[PDB]
Amino acid sequence: MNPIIYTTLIMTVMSGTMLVMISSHWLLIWIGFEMNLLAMIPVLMKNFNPRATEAATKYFLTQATASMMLMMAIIINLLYSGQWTITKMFNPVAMTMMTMALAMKLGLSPFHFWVPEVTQGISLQAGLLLLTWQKLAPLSVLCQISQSINPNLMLTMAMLSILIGGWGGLNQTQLRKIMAYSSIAHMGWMTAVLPYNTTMTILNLLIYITMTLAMFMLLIHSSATTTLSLSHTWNKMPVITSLMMVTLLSMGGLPPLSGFMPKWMIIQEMTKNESIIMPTLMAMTALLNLYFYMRLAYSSSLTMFPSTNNMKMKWQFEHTKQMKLLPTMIVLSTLVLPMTPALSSLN
Template sequence: MLKNSYKMLFLIMLFLGTLISISASSWFSVWMGLEINLLSFIPLMMKTNNLYSSEAALKYFLTQALASSVLLFFIIFFSFISFKMMEKTNFIFNIIFASSFMMKIGMAPFHFWFPIVMEGLNWINNLILMTWQKIAPIILLSYCMNFNFFIFSIIFSIIIGSINGLNQTSIRKLLAYSSINHLGWMLTGILNNQNIWMIYFLFYCFLSISIVLIFNNFKIFNFNQIFSFFNFKNLIKTLIFIPLLSLGGLPPFLGFFPKWMMINYLMTMNYFFLLMLLIYFTLITLYFYLRLSYSSFLLNYNEMNWNFNHFYNLNNFFLLSFFLFMNLFGLIFINLFFFLF
């Protein structure tokens, strides 16, 4: 028997739940897939020797159950009304369904649970929460579009994700608020062009994987642990901060490419006010990444605040070097590809 083989079962059910939701032909099947996904992720979050993970799992379950119950109630309610009444209440239908999906992904103004849950989980579970768990609700959001409500949620998300990240000392909470900010960009893509948000999401997943693997490798959770890297060469610090700056969208790193695409498309659609808000508040998120990088490179603390378990095996080094290389030169390769083909 494999050690912790139950995790493989719940991972398979986690993926299956998402696939059921995005390929369903009825709203009840959508709800069923979301519930399978939820009940498969809860055991993966739980750790018997960690009370914080149990608390995070309980909070995640309560918020997801609230969103699912609202979704199920209105699925049943709208199934009993006539088609003519359905046309009159289409506006309410879109807002209620969109709200339940936004609560499931932690998008503002339903973001209250997301940073707290991420703080109690390990890096691998955080990676699942930031990437795979967003796929089904975001795709389902595109089925119930409401322009005014989406614009309100986009503006609220980029403001909350930018301002609340300024005073954070926990890297997990910082990435949580950064994820809320990125959700604003993704919802902008859903509102205008389906292909753009899918490309943006794929790049966001790649950058999140590179960041989480680095922090998980060095067991880093707070800023003061990064400052205590005083005895390391600049290569290690570069390995940490290039993906962070890329996630913030700093040119010429890879993370600038999806934002560049979104900016070009919004300019062609004449959404100048929305574009201005997106750029200004994204600069704030880039500011706290730059502040973190600047402090760790130029300030040295001579006292270790944590006992690190460093992994210097060759496989980890090559994997992290690959992510560093792609973040540094990925934008050049993409431009070269478009130039040639």
């Protein structure tokens, strides 16, 4: 793919998301979704192979179905109110259709399978862009229509997301599938807090984006797509493994790392509204995510796996390409707990 074509497709993806986030009209929001998907498919298929083709096919099928359901919800809402502005929806059936469509777009359970499948299919850069940006847009739509969200449906899907992410990540060995299930669990947390405080939803989104960017860029730097491939990194660049270990500890929610702040604020906010069973279950279920983060950390940094003989040549050579903002992402994803009251600025 030509660099100019790639950069214009990335610009088109970003333009679709920005159209979604600035539009006050349901038709324009749908147009933004369509533009994002249309420009996102070739980005997935950039490195041509059957796995990438299959991942793009599954992604297209899922997103097209979600867009059809979303447009049906928009039309039904127009039928009963004659309003196009994106506000509280005036029909419960239309609202349920919209909620299920946006959940399918986000990958919330039970609409999650495509997330690990596509992430395994596509490359590391494609997976990074997918997770980050394609979580970014539908969450903005949900925040706009939050006041009419059915709390029962939203919390059911969020709790299912957390459970499914924990269990899948427990079983997996591929790094991209592990990242996909981590994304599912974090989306579950965000949408769980969504009906109460969109500010807390945005805070969780930002912290998750920072941690995911740091982790994916470390994987790109070390060129590791499996556990054993990551087990050789201590013999070439041991600093990358240490940074990955602290980032993994942060993603598990261990204090005083940055990943504790979203969980803490969400639990506080949910308890303010007399929710106790849901926060306790959500907090306890994150131990599965922490377990598979810790299992990944044992192989990479805390223990020394056997290496090979050509690692000597790899020692002799030096990394050429420089990752942009990797130190900033690594610092922001581990050492911003003392800066917690900035969520009022985020408000």
